[PDB]
Design an enzyme around this catalytic site. Sequence first.
Site, PDB file in Angstrom:
ATOM      1  N   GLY A 130       0.883  -1.154   0.000  1.00 20.36           N
ATOM      2  CA  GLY A 130       0.000   0.000   0.000  1.00 20.36           C
ATOM      3  C   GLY A 130       0.921   1.204   0.000  1.00 20.36           C
ATOM      4  O   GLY A 130       2.112   1.061   0.312  1.00 20.36           O
ATOM      5  N   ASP A 132      -0.700  -6.305   1.932  1.00 19.71           N
ATOM      6  CA  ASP A 132      -1.760  -5.362   2.286  1.00 19.71           C
ATOM      7  C   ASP A 132      -1.447  -4.621   3.569  1.00 19.71           C
ATOM      8  O   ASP A 132      -1.953  -4.937   4.638  1.00 19.71           O
ATOM      9  CB  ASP A 132      -3.119  -6.058   2.380  1.00 19.71           C
ATOM     10  N   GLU A 133      -0.563  -3.645   3.440  1.00 21.49           N
ATOM     11  CA  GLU A 133      -0.157  -2.803   4.541  1.00 21.49           C
ATOM     12  C   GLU A 133       0.029  -1.417   3.964  1.00 21.49           C
ATOM     13  O   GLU A 133       0.332  -1.274   2.766  1.00 21.49           O
ATOM     14  CB  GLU A 133       1.155  -3.305   5.160  1.00 21.49           C
ATOM     15  N   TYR A 134      -0.258  -0.412   4.793  1.00 20.98           N
ATOM     16  CA  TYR A 134      -0.116   1.019   4.467  1.00 20.98           C
ATOM     17  C   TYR A 134      -1.023   1.640   3.421  1.00 20.98           C
ATOM     18  O   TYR A 134      -0.790   2.784   3.036  1.00 20.98           O
ATOM     19  CB  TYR A 134       1.308   1.325   4.043  1.00 20.98           C
TER      20      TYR A 134
END
Length: 265
Positions: free
Chosen positions: A87, A126-128
Amino acid sequence: KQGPTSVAYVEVNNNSMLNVGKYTLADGGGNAFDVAVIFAANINYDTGTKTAYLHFNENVQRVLDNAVTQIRPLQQQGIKVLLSVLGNHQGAGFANFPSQQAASAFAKQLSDAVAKYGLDGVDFEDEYAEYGNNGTAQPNDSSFVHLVTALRANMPDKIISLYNIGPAASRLSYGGVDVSDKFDYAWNPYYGTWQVPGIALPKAQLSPAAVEIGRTSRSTVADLARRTVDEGYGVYLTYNLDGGDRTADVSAFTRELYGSEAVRT
């Protein structure tokens, strides 16, 4: 070589992918790392057009433009190279697409990059993403399933891995399609820990152990390597390999996973 498949993520911003190939098993063995992962491209957002796009910072872009010298040597060694996507604080995330067609179009950008750069697959992180920014929606149930289905339809012979984390990781089914089986691997994101990914993938395609080359203790590296084999899992993840002489850290895991020391250069 016989044992779990070991993966090494490389932060190409400050590190060379080429270091993944310098480690081999002291015995007949072979590579200490089986998969190398380029960290990382991003999912950005065009706020004016309401559409997400696959972004490559100049550094990642350069690794790619220079694939013959930065990636092919690893691949010649037998090492599979993956592009990782993260992300980028823009609202748009993997569990955020408004429609199948929007998710499909992003799937296409990933697919094309794999082909254009002769890569071996894509890895999802799926981070940030910061769902909600720029008027985006909160995670929905269909977005990630649409993305994985579309991506896998585009490149049925490449790897698709899941970095076990974020909204997407637990939104694997929508419609009569569960995209779990469309993944080749799923790994724990937390260094120096053991966290079995909940995704319905066989133990051979999962990596509960996550270690960081350089920041995770050596007794901990061996312990998780030994636990990987003993528990029946077939993947072992190593984060942030650098250009320093990490021969002993690598040996702490090669010893348990394959019954051998590592040698560098």
